[PDB]
């Protein structure tokens, strides 16, 4: 019975991280800029 | 470098002199020893978890293990001296003076 | 030492996906299979070059896609993807096995009224192949160059020249 | 935060019990009425030691549930086993070293 | 074969705990080489994907690496559903 | 103890070098010296006596606070530069932490205290183990990060220890506590080379557990550990005598015996770096050894000492102990200066 | 709001020790053929107040003790750690989710011994630092059993996290795959909190007072519940429906209920053991098995493709 | 603030320190390290090492520090000494604490301080990562690891156990 749900967990866990890598690339690019924005805010206080 | 590293090796240093300057006790020198590794446990942690550097993240444990079986070798040894003499006292431990 | 280039706010300026996270958990599956190609550009770009300040074009056409792949799910199948992913929310681990009955309505919705197929088991995770036009970079670490190895000791191994020479040793 | 609160909650409040404990009102007016060896076995300390060596090695089996994740299986298991029996021939030695009587 | 059978039977009156223990931890090291499941373990662990899988630039010359996640190349799952 | 439990802890201890000389990471160094220090402690404590336990215990301190010292040298190391490679290391107070921390576990002066005391208060073979075994590992470590240590510790180090070496052992009776100055002495040279030519380090460690090794085996061969006692020899052994004799002249580096080649090696690596001062002063203060070699000559072999009525008894019967490998050892101890150019075999 | 939540864990904690006592007594009683308390209260329902109370207004007779501040020590690391150890309980949801919540229960746990060997301290006598020592040997004994026999289980479950012991269960209790790790397991707990038939300390003291005495015996109490929650979520797992989490808490209660009276009933039933044998019973039978199960767990699922998920 | 919470911890860190190295009875002694051994569990909880926070409670204050106290009841102090009542202790524990208060404020006062070397002052925040999205804990990763990896580790490390055990039974037969 452990076995049959394990496996069964298993093909869970992998619909779950299949969903995290479709949506990597969405928020990388968000990661991307929200970095960029940051460092050029601080770049603004900087020069004052 | 980092503020908390100035106070892990400042632990350090209380130990290690703590160690090299004995009382009576050989307990409590043994102690001392043993905030030596607690000190280095922390400052190989810290250091391991802020580079992640990923593999390196076992050597604590393994310092760890290593250390507490050193320490049980010690604890030992300070048995069988209290077996001796009745107490744990360094004084008593002069016998190769001559 | 330089001046960190950085590009201007306005050149970081685009439109934000501004749904929450069980809503994109709900649309995950089919949100992979339907906008792979310019993800896939994007992350072979972010990859290759080691630097976001190269890639932002490549993240831009990322959001313009997810919104257009957002406003064909508003436009036809509207209702059932509110009750999927409004029941993946309740969940405070969003646990897809928690909503099959919904999960059904909504992929039943956007296979009849837009053709997608929810990818198998395992297909997301594949390794796929990018055509781009972007040229491959040459040095991403900006390495210098490295330095000359030192000269190859070589030729043919002979006895030493009168032995260890070593004081009075004539061997 | 939330952990550092219910800690700071829980022995408070066994602070203030065990305060409370020791004060209370008692009706009275009149006055209320070293570093040795303990006689005590060394089969004792061997307890205490081998639990100690014992506990190094279960911490090094801690990290078994997230080992069975590699793909690297051949070599997890092997080296589990391998831990395990070290640890039964620990158990072994004292045992037949006579470690784990009590008589005498 | 007698004598050993001889032995075990005094050991299984006389210390039975010791007896199952010594046998749950042969099983534990004998049964992993015999069992044909244990080669399954090995296939799963691979095909949990913990980190983004990384696309491969396109040369021309990789038919056997699918353009899409839904093409038919690359590793297949259908022996781990029925699973 | 038990004679397979003898056999595997003396395993344990070889075990433990051999982890430290093969090792290329700092953690496994550091996990070399705590397996040796952890299955050295019950040989020095298998006879069961109050010295014993007093030699074991300072024996614990000073090398389990030497191995603190080491893994702190380690992780100040891993901050500066991110990696264990066992190599230079990369921050000159990590430099000064493991070079201190060696000389702790060599028993150099100023940190020599502890080897004349723990190796009276163990068993001769206890003690052979001590001064010749358990050298190789910190001396397989100086090998390697001698790049990085600072060359004005090192030297104070080595002529403290030559100094203390010398002097120690003019005032002393007993055979355990006058091997033991004498290796203090002995590290001094070993050291003072090593910035300059490290294959000199390793022909003189050789040659000088070669030695020691060969006086503590003839120390067993007779159950002697004092200087009277071993002045009995002439009357039991004459051979004996005369092996100590030659031993004893090769140690104190005459010439044209074995124990010669290390210090003739070492001035000649000196002289070639312009250091001319510090050899001169190492030869002329290596005379002290000598002069308490030349006393133990003096009182074993070169002079007949008064003997006992019991020793007609001792006539009677034959030596039974195993003296393992002392014809090869003697012979190596005296003989060896005329094939002095094979030290390139260990390069 | 979070601080309401702490209050609404620690109060029933301390309300349910309270009136264990009464059922206990009432338990064996009728194990005895007779009735316990039915006088304070009906029922005898009012009992445990009148104790409390009793024990509280007591004259606190504390003999000049060897360390003032050990004494007072004692008493507050016992009572609040064993509070501690219900922080991470999924009921089906924890006050704290801890991704290492087993482990932060098994850290917390080995620090108890501290109250034992600190209250042996400021006894200021031998006697009494005799028999700290001896309980304390009984309990780090019985520590290495409870963490491997932990670590077996987890093998199926897959992580460190309590509330992923409920999804390991959703088919089946862990008690079939596990039971001879479950014997192991509630046996160990026994002797882990001191409970007949491994109640030495009483026993041999045979052979503290007013609030204080109150204070490590509600926090007995509460370990002695607290285990045998732990209990029933390692091996008796209930399921859990999210919109219904209260069906969780009924069910997962009633054998958590049950587990308790099932360690009055052992009580009520055999004899005690000597000290030479429970450490018998440890060493050389719960260890060997302990270690063999230990092996056949970690080979198990690997051998027939059941390795959990991290996750 | 709650961003100083690393460096507040390390300043208790060093008290317990001072605290056990002025060596006052080793029964006094013994809980100073174990407030240590606690603060210091919560500096590398900080540092985002749980397991290895928890292994400090588990293993070096749950096992090697009760071993500790249960060897000191035994053969060293059974009845505890007054706390600071010996001169010598009580000097180095003030000592200690005024080099460590001078250390704290100074570093407080101008944000860094040279205590021989040159720290910075500006809390330990700002050398943290700022890009962690993974389905995991890296800690739990590398120590995971020590079965893929490390057999040559394993090997070591478990002979040196058992050669422990054996080596304590020799010394305390006797
Ligand atoms: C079986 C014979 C095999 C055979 O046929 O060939 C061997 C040889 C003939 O072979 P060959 O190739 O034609 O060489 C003969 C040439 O005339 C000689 O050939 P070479 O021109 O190449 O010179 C020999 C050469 C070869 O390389 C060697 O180093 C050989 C070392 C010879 C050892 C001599 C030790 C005794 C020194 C004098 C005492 O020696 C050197 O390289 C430099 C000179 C070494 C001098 C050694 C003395 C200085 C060392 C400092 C410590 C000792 C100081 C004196 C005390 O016959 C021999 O003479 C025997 C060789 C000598 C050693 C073996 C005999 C042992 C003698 C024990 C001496 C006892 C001392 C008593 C006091
Ligand atoms: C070029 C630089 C300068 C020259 C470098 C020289 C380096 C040293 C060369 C090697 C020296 C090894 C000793 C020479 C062998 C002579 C001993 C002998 O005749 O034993 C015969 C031996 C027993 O004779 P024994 O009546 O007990 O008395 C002999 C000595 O007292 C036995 O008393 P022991 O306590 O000294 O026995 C030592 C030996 C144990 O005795 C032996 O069995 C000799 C084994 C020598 C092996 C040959 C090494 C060369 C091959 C390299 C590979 O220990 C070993 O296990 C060998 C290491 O009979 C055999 O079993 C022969 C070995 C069978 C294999
Ligand atoms: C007694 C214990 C202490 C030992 C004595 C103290 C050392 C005394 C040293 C005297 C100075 C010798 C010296 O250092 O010369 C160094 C110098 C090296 O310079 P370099 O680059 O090689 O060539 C150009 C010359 N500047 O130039 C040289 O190298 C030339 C020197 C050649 C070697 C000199 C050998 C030692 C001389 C001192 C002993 C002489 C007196 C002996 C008396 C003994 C009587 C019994
Ligand atoms: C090159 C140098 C080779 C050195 C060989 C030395 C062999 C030992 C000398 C023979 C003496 C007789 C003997 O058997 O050794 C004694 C010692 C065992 O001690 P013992 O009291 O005699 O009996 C043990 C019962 N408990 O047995 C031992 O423990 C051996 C101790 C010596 C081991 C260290 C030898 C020096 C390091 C050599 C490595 C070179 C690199
Ligand atoms: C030999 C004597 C030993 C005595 C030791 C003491 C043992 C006490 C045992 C206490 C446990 C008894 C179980 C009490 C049942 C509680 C009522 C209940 O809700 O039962 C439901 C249960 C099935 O539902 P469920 O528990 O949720 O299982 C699904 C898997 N997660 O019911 C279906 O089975
Ligand atoms: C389900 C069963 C089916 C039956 C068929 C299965 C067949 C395959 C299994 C066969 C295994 C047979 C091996 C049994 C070995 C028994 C050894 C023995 O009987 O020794 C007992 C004795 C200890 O008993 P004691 O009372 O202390 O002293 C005797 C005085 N009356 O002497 C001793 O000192 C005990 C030996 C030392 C302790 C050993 C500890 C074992 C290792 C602990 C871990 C357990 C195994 C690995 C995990
Ligand atoms: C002499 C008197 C002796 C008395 C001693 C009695 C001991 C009382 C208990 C001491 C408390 C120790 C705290 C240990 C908590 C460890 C639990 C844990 O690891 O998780 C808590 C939290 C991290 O949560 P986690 O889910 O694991 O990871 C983050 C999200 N994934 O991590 C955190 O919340 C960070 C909290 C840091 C502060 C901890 C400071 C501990 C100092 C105690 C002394
Ligand atoms: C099937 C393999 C599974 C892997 C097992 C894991 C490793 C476990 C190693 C345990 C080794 C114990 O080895 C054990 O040694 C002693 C030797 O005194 C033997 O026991 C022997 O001594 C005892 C006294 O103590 C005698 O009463 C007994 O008659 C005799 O058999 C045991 O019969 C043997 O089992
Ligand atoms: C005192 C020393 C104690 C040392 C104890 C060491 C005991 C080791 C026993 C188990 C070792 C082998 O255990 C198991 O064997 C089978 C061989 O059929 C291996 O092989 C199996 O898994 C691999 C995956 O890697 C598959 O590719 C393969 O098809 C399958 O047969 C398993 O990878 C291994 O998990
Ligand atoms: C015996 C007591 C042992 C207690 C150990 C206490 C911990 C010791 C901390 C060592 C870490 C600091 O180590 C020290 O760091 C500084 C910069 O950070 C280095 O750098 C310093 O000296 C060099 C000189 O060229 C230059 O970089 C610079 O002038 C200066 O910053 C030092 O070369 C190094 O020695
Ligand atoms: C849990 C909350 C309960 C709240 C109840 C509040 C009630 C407050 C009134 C407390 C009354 C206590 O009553 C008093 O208790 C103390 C206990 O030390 C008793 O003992 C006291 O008096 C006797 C002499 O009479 C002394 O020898 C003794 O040393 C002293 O402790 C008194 O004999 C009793 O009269
Ligand atoms: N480190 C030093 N100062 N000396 C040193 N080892 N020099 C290297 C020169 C050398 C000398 C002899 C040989 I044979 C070889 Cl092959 C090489
Ligand atoms: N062992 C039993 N069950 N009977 C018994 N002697 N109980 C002790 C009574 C008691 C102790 C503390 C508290 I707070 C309360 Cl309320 C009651």
Redesign the interface.
């Known amino acids: 019975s452990m076995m049959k749900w394990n496996r069964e967990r298993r093909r869970l866990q992998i619909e779950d991280f299949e969903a995290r890598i479709a949506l990597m690339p969405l928020l990388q690019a968000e990661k991307d800029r929200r970095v960029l924005q940051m460092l050029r805010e601080n770049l603004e206080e900087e020069a004052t | 470098?980092?503020?908390?590293?100035?106070?892990?090796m400042?632990?350090?240093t209380?130990?290690?002199?703590?160690?090299?300057?004995y009382?009576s006790?050989?307990?409590?020198?043994?102690?001392?020893?043993?905030?030596?590794?607690?000190?280095?446990?922390?400052?190989?942690?810290?250091?391991?978890?802020?580079?992640?550097?990923?593999?390196?993240?076992?050597?604590?444990?393994?310092?760890?293990?290593?250390?507490?079986?050193?320490?049980?070798?010690?604890?030992?040894?300070?048995?069988?001296?209290?077996?001796?003499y009745?107490?744990?006292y360094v004084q008593n431990?002069?016998?190769?003076?001559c | 030492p330089g001046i960190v280039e950085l590009p201007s706010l306005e050149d970081l300026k685009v439109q934000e996906v501004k749904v929450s996270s069980s809503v994109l958990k709900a649309a995950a599956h089919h949100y992979g299979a339907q906008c792979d190609k310019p993800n896939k550009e994007f992350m072979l770009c972010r990859w290759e070059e080691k630097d976001p300040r190269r890639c932002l074009e490549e993240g831009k056409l990322v959001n313009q896609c997810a919104l257009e792949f957002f406003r064909q799910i508003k436009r036809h199948c509207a209702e059932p993807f509110t009750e999927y992913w409004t029941c993946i929310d309740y969940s405070g681990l969003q646990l897809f096995r928690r909503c099959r009955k919904q999960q059904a309505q909504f992929d039943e919705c956007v296979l009849d009224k837009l053709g997608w197929v929810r990818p198998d088991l395992g297909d997301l995770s594949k390794v796929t192949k990018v055509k781009t036009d972007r040229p491959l970079p040459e040095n991403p670490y900006h390495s210098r160059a490295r330095p000359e190895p030192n000269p190859e000791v070589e030729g043919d191994l002979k006895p030493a020249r009168h032995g260890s020479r070593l004081f009075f040793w004539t061997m | 935060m939330n952990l550092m609160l219910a800690l700071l909650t829980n022995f408070t409040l066994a602070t203030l019990l065990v305060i409370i404990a020791f004060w209370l009102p008692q009706l009275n007016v009149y006055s209320e009425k070293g570093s040795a060896r303990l006689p005590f076995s060394m089969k004792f300390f061997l307890v205490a030691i081998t639990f100690l060596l014992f506990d190094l090695e279960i911490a090094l089996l801690l990290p078994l549930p997230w080992a069975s994740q590699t793909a690297n299986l051949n070599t997890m298991l092997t080296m589990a086993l391998f831990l395990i029996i070290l640890l039964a021939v620990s158990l072994a030695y004292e045992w037949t070293q006579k470690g784990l009587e009590w008589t005498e | 074969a007698e004598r050993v059978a001889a032995f075990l039977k005094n050991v299984w009156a006389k210390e039975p705990v010791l007896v199952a223990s010594f046998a749950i931890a042969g099983l534990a090291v004998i049964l992993p080489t015999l069992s044909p499941y244990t080669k399954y373990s090995l296939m799963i662990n691979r095909a949990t994907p913990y980190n983004y899988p990384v696309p491969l630039r396109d040369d021309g010359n990789m038919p056997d690496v699918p353009s899409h996640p839904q093409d038919p190349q690359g590793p297949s799952l259908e022996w781990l559903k029925r699973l | 103890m038990n004679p397979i439990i003898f056999i595997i802890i003396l395993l344990t201890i070889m075990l433990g070098t051999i982890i430290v000389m093969i090792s290329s990471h700092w953690l496994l160094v550091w996990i070399g010296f705590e397996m040796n220090m952890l299955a050295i402690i019950p040989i020095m404590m298998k006879n069961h006596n109050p010295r014993a336990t007093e030699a074991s215990t300072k024996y614990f301190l000073t090398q389990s606070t030497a191995s603190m010292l080491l893994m702190m040298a380690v992780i100040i190391n891993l901050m500066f530069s991110g990696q264990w490679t066992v190599m230079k290391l990369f921050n000159p107070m990590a430099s000064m932490l493991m070079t201190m921390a060696l000389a702790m576990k060599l028993g150099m002066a100023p940190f020599h205290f502890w080897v004349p005391e723990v190796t009276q208060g163990i068993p001769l073979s206890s003690g052979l183990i001590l001064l010749t075994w358990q050298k190789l590992a910190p001396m397989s470590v100086l090998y390697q990060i001698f790049p990085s240590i600072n060359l004005n510790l090192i030297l104070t180090l080595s002529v403290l220890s030559i100094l203390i070496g010398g002097w120690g052992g003019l005032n002393q009776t007993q055979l355990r506590k006058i091997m033991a100055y004498s290796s203090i002495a002995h590290m001094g040279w070993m050291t003072a080379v090593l910035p300059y030519n490290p294959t000199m380090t390793l022909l003189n460690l050789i040659i000088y557990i070669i030695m020691t090794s060969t006086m503590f085996t003839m120390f067993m061969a007779n159950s002697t550990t004092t200087t009277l006692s071993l002045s009995h020899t002439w009357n039991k052994t004459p051979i004996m005598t005369v092996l100590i004799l030659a031993t004893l002249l090769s140690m104190g580096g005459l010439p044209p015996l074995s124990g010669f080649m290390p210090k003739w090696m070492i001035i000649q690596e000196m002289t070639k770096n312009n250091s001319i001062i510090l050899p001169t002063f190492m030869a002329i203060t290596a005379l002290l050894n000598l002069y308490f070699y030349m006393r133990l000559t003096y009182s074993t072999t070169l002079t007949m000492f008064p003997s006992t009525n019991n020793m007609k008894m001792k006539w009677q019967f034959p030596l039974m102990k195993k003296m393992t490998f002392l014809p090869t050892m003697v012979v190596l101890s005296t003989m060896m200066l005329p094939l002095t150019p094979m030290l390139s075999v260990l390069e | 709001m979070f601080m309401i939540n702490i209050l609404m864990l620690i109060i029933p904690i301390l309300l349910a020790v309270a009136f264990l006592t009464l059922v206990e007594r009432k338990v064996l009683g009728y194990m005895q053929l007779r009735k316990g308390p039915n006088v304070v209260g009906p029922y005898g329902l009012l009992q445990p107040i009148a104790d409390a109370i009793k024990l509280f207004i007591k004259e606190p007779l504390r003999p000049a003790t060897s360390s003032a501040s050990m004494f007072i020590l004692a008493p507050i690391m016992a009572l609040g750690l064993a509070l501690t150890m219900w922080i991470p309980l999924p009921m089906p949801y924890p006050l704290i989710n801890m991704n290492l919540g087993v482990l932060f229960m098994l850290a917390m746990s080995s620090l108890a011994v501290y109250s034992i060997l600190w209250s042996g301290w400021a006894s200021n006598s031998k006697y009494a630092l005799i028999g700290a020592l001896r309980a304390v040997a009984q309990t780090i004994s019985y520590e290495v059993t409870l963490a491997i026999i932990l670590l077996s289980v987890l093998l199926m479950s897959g992580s460190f996290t309590l509330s992923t012991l409920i999804t390991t269960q959703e088919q089946m209790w862990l008690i079939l795959p596990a039971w001879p790790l479950a014997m192991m397991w509630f046996i160990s707990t026994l002797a882990e909190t001191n409970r007949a038939p491994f109640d030495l300390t009483e026993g041999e003291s045979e052979l503290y007072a007013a609030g204080p005495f109150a204070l490590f015996f509600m926090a007995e109490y509460a370990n002695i519940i607290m285990m045998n929650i732990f209990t029933a979520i390692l091996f008796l797992g209930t399921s859990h429906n999210p919109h219904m989490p209260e069906l969780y808490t009924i069910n997962f209660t009633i054998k958590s209920l049950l587990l308790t009276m099932s360690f009055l009933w052992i009580r009520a039933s055999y004899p005690r053991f000597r000290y030479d044998q429970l450490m018998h019973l440890l060493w050389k039978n719960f260890l060997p098995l302990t270690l063999a199960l230990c092996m056949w767990h970690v080979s198990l699922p690997i051998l027939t493709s059941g390795i959990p998920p991290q996750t | 603030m709650m961003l100083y919470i690393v460096f507040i911890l390390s300043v208790i860190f060093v008290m317990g320190f001072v605290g056990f190295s002025s060596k006052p009875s080793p029964i006094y002694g013994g809980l100073g390290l174990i407030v240590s051994g606690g603060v210091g569990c919560g500096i590398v909880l900080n540092f985002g090492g749980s397991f290895l926070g928890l292994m400090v409670f588990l293993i070096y204050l749950g096992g090697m520090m009760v071993v500790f106290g249960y060897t000191t009841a035994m053969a060293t102090e059974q009845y505890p000494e007054i706390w600071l009542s010996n001169k010598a202790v009580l000097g180095a524990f003030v000592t200690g604490l005024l080099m460590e208060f001078f250390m704290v404020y100074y570093v407080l006062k101008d944000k860094e301080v040279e205590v021989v070397f040159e720290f910075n002052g500006l809390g330990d925040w700002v050398i943290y990562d700022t890009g962690d999205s993974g389905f995991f804990s890296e800690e739990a990763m590398g120590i995971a690891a020590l079965y893929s990896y490390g057999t040559w580790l394993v090997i070591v490390t478990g002979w040196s156990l058992l050669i422990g055990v054996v080596v304590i039974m020799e010394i305390t037969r006797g």
Do not use: W
């Open positions: 470098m980092s503020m908390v590293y100035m106070n892990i400042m632990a350090f209380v130990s290690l002199v703590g160690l090299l300057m009382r006790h050989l307990m409590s020198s043994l102690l001392c020893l043993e905030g030596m590794m607690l000190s280095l446990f922390v400052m190989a942690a810290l250091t391991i978890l802020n580079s992640h550097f990923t593999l390196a993240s076992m050597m604590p444990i393994i310092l760890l293990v290593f250390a507490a079986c050193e320490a049980a070798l010690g604890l030992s040894l300070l048995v069988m001296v209290s077996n001796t009745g107490t744990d431990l002069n016998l190769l003076q």
